[PDB]
Amino acid sequence: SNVVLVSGEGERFTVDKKIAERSLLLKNYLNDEIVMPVPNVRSSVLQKVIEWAEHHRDSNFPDEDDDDSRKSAPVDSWDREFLKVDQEMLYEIILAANYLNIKPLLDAGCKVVAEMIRGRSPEEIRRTFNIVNDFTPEEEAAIRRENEWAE
């Protein structure tokens, strides 16, 4: 009734079996305690993933094929207070949910990055213009000459 989620750093995390079947990759691994490697995820990120699965033991999520029930689903209050973390560790939680095939954590953890791409100031969309190249310098000069009249 317990499985073990071995992290990439080597720590063993004994999780209850029904709670840990939120992961589609582990619930399919159980067709063979029962240990399993999670090779890229650190111990802290896997601990966050396991705590997320501990809260959503009884939760009800969309059917992973929904048009609007998946896109327009708001984040939980626990999911928003839960992901007030470092940015790279947020992306590593998203990578952990992508490896472990946890679609609702790859949903609620990934609407936060979507809320951070929008909702940002136009001043630092103007600043981050060609931090990745994406334009020739002739086209960059033509763009900066096109909207020079404003400022």
Binding site for other proteins (CB under 8 A): 24-25, 27-29, 31-32, 37, 39-40, 60, 63-72, 87-88, 91, 94-95, 98-99, 101, 106-107, 110-111, 113-114, 116-126, 128-137, 143, 147, 149-150
Residues in contact with 7: Cβ distance below 8 Å, sequence separation at least 6, in sequence order: 13, 38, 41, 42, 43, 46
CA 124/CA 127 separation, integer angstroms:
5
DSSP structural state of residue 13: E
For residue 128, the minimal CB distance to other proteins (Å) is 5
Of 33, 37, 82, 31, whose CA–CA distance to 56 is shortest? Answer: 82
User: Toward other proteins, which CB reaches closer, 68 or 81?
Assistant: 68
Whether 82 and 52 have beta carbons less than 8 Å apart is answered as yes
**CA 82 to CA 19: how far, in whole Å?**
18
Q: Least Å distance between CB 17 and other proteins?
A: 14
CB of 10 to other proteins, least distance (A): 13
Q: Are 22 and 51 in contact (CB under 8 A)?
A: no
CB of 74 to other proteins, least distance (A): 11
